Amino acid sequence: SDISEISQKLPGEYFRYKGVPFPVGLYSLESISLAENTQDVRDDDIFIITYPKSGTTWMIEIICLILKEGDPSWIRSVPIWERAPWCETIVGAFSLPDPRLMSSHLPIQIFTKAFFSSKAKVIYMGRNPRDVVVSLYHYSKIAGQLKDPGTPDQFLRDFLKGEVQFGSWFDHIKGWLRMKGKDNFLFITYEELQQDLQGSVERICGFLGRPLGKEALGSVVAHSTFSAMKANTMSNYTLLPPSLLDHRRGAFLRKGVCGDWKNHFTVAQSEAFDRAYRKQMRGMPTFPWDE
Ligand SMILES: Nc1ncnc2c1ncn2[C@@H]1O[C@H](COP(=O)(O)O)[C@@H](OP(=O)(O)O)[C@H]1O
Ligand SMILES: C[C@]12CC[C@H](O)CC1=CC[C@@H]1[C@@H]2CC[C@]2(C)C(=O)CC[C@@H]12
Numbered sequence: 001s002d003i004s005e006i007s008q009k010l011p012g013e014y015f016r017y018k019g020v021p022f023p024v025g026l027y028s029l030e031s032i033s034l035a036e037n038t039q040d041v042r043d044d045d046i047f048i049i050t051y052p053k054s055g056t057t058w059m060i061e062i063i064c065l066i067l068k069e070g071d072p073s074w075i076r077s078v079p080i081w082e083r084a085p086w087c088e089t090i091v092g093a094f095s096l097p098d099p100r101l102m103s104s105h106l107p108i109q110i111f112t113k114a115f116f117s118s119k120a121k122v123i124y125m126g127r128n129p130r131d132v133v134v135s136l137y138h139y140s141k142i143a144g145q146l147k148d149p150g151t152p153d154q155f156l157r158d159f160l161k162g163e164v165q166f167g168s169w170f171d172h173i174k175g176w177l178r179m180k181g182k183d184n185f186l187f188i189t190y191e192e193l194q195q196d197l198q199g200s201v202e203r204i205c206g207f208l209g210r211p212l213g214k215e216a217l218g219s220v221v222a223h224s225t226f227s228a229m230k231a232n233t234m235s236n237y238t239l240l241p242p243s244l245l246d247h248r249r250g251a252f253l254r255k256g257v258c259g260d261w262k263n264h265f266t267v268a269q270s271e272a273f274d275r276a277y278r279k280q281m282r283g284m285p286t287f288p289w290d291e
């Protein structure tokens with residue numbers, strides 16, 4: 001009823017915090033400021049950081065299963081957004097009572113500053129920016145906090161100019177990779193999980209210091225699969241208020257594959273995009289999505 005009243009009042013617009021665009025209604029100068037400056041960062045805290053639409057949900061479910069050592073009970077009975085609350089959202093983990101698992105879309109220059117001097121763990125996940133553009137385009141049409149994308153072509157110019165929620169994808173990931181090297185930082189991609197979920201899971205277990213038996217492992221893998229996840233009412237967001245997410249028009253877990261961009265980018269849009277990528281990612285290393 002509280003979340004319901006809020007959802008129906010969403011303008012579908014943006015406001016800015018230190019130069020970055022944030023959706024109006026689900027974020028505030030204060031909700032963000034709090035996450036940025038809070039001192040409450042713990043040694044065993046766990047953060048999942050991503051640029052929107054990179055497969056956050058997938059990562060969140062994977063760790064919820066790892067923490068419960070494969071027992072689906074927790075993900076079947078508790079809402080996904082409650083198991084790994086968002087830091088910057090008006091109703092965030094920092095504006096709630098009590099291993100803490102948290103989620104965030106904040107770019108490194110705004111993320112909880114007290115982190116850099118802590119032992120908390122951060123898993124950063126990246127996805128092919130092209131597939132992110134698609135996922136985000138569709139999701140915008142059904143997400144109450146987001147403005148309509150407009151034409152695929154205009155939405156792409158907005159994306160390339162960082163004129164979208166959370167700013168530039170380029171800046172976002174370039175900034176966060178600056179942590180690559182600290183032992184309490186893990187960088188993994190949506191593409192790696194797609195190519196070998198089990199391998200990725202074991203990897204993430206090593207990183208977290210939480211080994212699993214061929215048993216629990218198999219369970220985490222089974223329940224993390226797209227098909228399984230889209231069927232879990234607590235994980236597929238079908239419980240959210242229609243205004244916040246138009247279930248009548250689409251699903252949060254849309255397709256769940258790599259390369260859908262190829263059915264959405266025209267060759268002209270693809271070429272323009274590559275020039276923008278080529279210029280912004282000049283010094284960067286090679287990623288799975290770099291063919
Ligand atoms: N278990 C899973 N397997 C594959 N894709 C998954 C997934 N869980 C979530 N996703 C995909 O991740 C995207 C949502 O990202 P986020 O959680 O960061 O908002 C969606 O992409 P698509 O729109 O391409 O289908 C969604 O289907
Ligand atoms: C939009 C967002 C925040 C951004 C995520 O990538 C997707 C998401 C899922 C559920 C939303 C949450 C914002 C905070 C909300 C509104 C809650 O308090 C419950 C449902 C939550």
Ligand code: NA
Nearest residue numbers: 140143144146
């Ligand atoms: Na919308």
